[PDB]
Design an enzyme around this catalytic site. Structure first.
Site, PDB file in Angstrom:
ATOM      1  N   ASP A  49      11.750  13.812  -2.567  1.00  0.00           N
ATOM      2  CA  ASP A  49      11.033  12.990  -3.511  1.00  0.00           C
ATOM      3  C   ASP A  49      10.928  11.359  -2.988  1.00  0.00           C
ATOM      4  O   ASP A  49      12.061  10.736  -2.878  1.00  0.00           O
ATOM      5  CB  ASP A  49      11.396  12.968  -5.057  1.00  0.00           C
ATOM      6  CG  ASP A  49      10.543  12.029  -5.731  1.00  0.00           C
ATOM      7  OD1 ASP A  49       9.540  12.803  -6.581  1.00  0.00           O
ATOM      8  OD2 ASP A  49      10.548  11.156  -5.930  1.00  0.00           O
ATOM      9  N   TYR A  54       8.702   2.091  -2.200  1.00  0.00           N
ATOM     10  CA  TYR A  54       9.921   2.196  -1.189  1.00  0.00           C
ATOM     11  C   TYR A  54       9.605   1.418  -0.316  1.00  0.00           C
ATOM     12  O   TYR A  54      10.227   0.391   0.140  1.00  0.00           O
ATOM     13  CB  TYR A  54      10.035   3.536  -0.633  1.00  0.00           C
ATOM     14  CG  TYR A  54      10.539   4.590  -1.932  1.00  0.00           C
ATOM     15  CD1 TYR A  54      10.708   4.614  -3.165  1.00  0.00           C
ATOM     16  CD2 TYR A  54      10.738   6.117  -1.141  1.00  0.00           C
ATOM     17  CE1 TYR A  54      11.020   5.519  -3.843  1.00  0.00           C
ATOM     18  CE2 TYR A  54      11.096   7.108  -1.875  1.00  0.00           C
ATOM     19  CZ  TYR A  54      11.315   6.493  -3.320  1.00  0.00           C
ATOM     20  OH  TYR A  54      11.966   7.766  -4.101  1.00  0.00           O
ATOM     21  N   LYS A  83       4.093   9.413  -4.181  1.00  0.00           N
ATOM     22  CA  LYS A  83       3.332   8.613  -5.145  1.00  0.00           C
ATOM     23  C   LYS A  83       2.588   7.434  -4.828  1.00  0.00           C
ATOM     24  O   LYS A  83       3.075   6.755  -3.997  1.00  0.00           O
ATOM     25  CB  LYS A  83       4.443   7.985  -6.340  1.00  0.00           C
ATOM     26  CG  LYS A  83       5.599   9.082  -6.736  1.00  0.00           C
ATOM     27  CD  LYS A  83       6.088   8.622  -7.800  1.00  0.00           C
ATOM     28  CE  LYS A  83       7.565   9.371  -8.007  1.00  0.00           C
ATOM     29  NZ  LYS A  83       8.522   8.814  -6.784  1.00  0.00           N
ATOM     30  N   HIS A 116       2.205   6.686  -9.663  1.00  0.00           N
ATOM     31  CA  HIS A 116       3.608   6.125 -10.187  1.00  0.00           C
ATOM     32  C   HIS A 116       3.460   5.461 -11.698  1.00  0.00           C
ATOM     33  O   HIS A 116       4.754   5.802 -12.368  1.00  0.00           O
ATOM     34  CB  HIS A 116       4.011   5.101  -9.042  1.00  0.00           C
ATOM     35  CG  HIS A 116       5.252   4.939  -8.850  1.00  0.00           C
ATOM     36  ND1 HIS A 116       5.964   4.804  -7.849  1.00  0.00           N
ATOM     37  CD2 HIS A 116       6.452   5.303  -9.940  1.00  0.00           C
ATOM     38  CE1 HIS A 116       7.247   4.717  -7.718  1.00  0.00           C
ATOM     39  NE2 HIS A 116       7.506   4.907  -8.762  1.00  0.00           N
TER      40      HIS A 116
END
Ligand SMILES: [Ca+2]
Ligand SMILES: [Ca+2]
Length: 280
Positions: A49, A54, A83, A116
């Site tokens: 995941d 990120y 996401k 998200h």
């Protein structure tokens, strides 16, 4: 049910998703990231995941690559989740962001793609883009992260496809009873982001007592509790020994009393951002 690392939940559209997976986190990128993802796969994880916010999908992509080859499996044995980030919510924007994510991860399809956050005024057009991509066969399943009941209600006045996942903060001090009930009743599968919440309970006496009676770590018993609540769990870690140890959660079971002892720890304490009160 939650008998082994490669046990799967069935989503409402028939898609099998692993009950247990690896969370990726704001790391870094490259060396340590890449190795964490590889390490987990070789050990026996089949769910990874990530999120575009990120900024480490390229690291994840390579870690998947060497994980696949050293475990001697196929890309298809794995379940990958990304996401769309807030800045990219909208119809065209979300179509574009999905393509960006696929490129960096080195994939031709995602297993699951999530919104998200429920950014007011943007998430419905984002959802339509997920549905399109779903309808085109580009994503196996499609869902949502950090949605409250009222967000799901509002989504479903205009949605053609219902969310398959609701990935949420969830731990012994935030047990989310009303939202979980609502989602189970809707056929929306719950997933916990940050199940171990930066180790925040790892000295708690109730949990330390329970951990001891089983010769387990607190982390191990929390993660088992996620599982016996029927919630998909994705603990973050980058340390090999930890990645391996967090997955050792199938040699035991918690009694109904142990489950009630841990449920009793509810405080309604949200450690992450409030889904009804956030600005990012
Ligand atoms: Ca950006
Ligand atoms: Ca965690």
């Amino acid at each position: 049910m939650t008998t082994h690392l490669q046990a799967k939940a069935t989503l409402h559209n028939g898609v099998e998703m692993p009950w247990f997976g690896l969370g990726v986190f704001q790391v870094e990128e490259g060396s340590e990231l890449v190795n964490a993802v590889k390490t987990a796969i070789v050990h026996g994880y089949r769910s990874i995941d990530t999120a575009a916010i990120y900024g480490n999908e390229a690291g994840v992509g390579e870690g998947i690559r060497e994980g696949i080859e050293e475990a001697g499996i196929s890309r298809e044995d794995l379940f990958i989740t990304s996401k769309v980030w807030n800045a990219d919510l909208g119809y065209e924007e979300t179509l574009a962001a999905f393509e960006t994510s696929l490129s960096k991860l080195g994939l031709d399809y995602l297993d699951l793609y999530l919104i998200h956050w429920p950014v007011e005024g943007k998430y419905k057009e984002a959802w339509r883009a997920l549905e399109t991509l779903y309808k085109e066969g580009r994503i196996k399943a499609i869902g949502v992260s950090n949605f409250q009941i009222h967000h799901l209600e509002d989504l479903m006045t205009a949605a053609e496809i219902k969310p398959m996942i609701n990935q949420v903060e969830f731990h012994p001090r935030l047990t989310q009873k009303e939202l979980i009930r609502y989602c189970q009743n809707q056929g929306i599968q719950m997933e916990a982001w940050s199940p171990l919440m930066q180790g925040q309970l790892l000295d708690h006496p109730v949990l330390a007592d329970i951990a001891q009676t089983y010769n387990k770590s607190v982390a191990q018993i929390i993660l088992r509790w996620d599982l016996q609540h029927g919630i998909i769990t994705i603990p973050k870690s980058t340390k090999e020994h930890r990645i391996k140890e967090n997955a050792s959660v199938f040699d035991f079971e918690l009694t109904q009393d142990d489950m009630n002892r841990i449920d009793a720890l509810n405080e309604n304490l949200r450690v992450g951002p409030d889904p009804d009160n956030f600005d990012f």
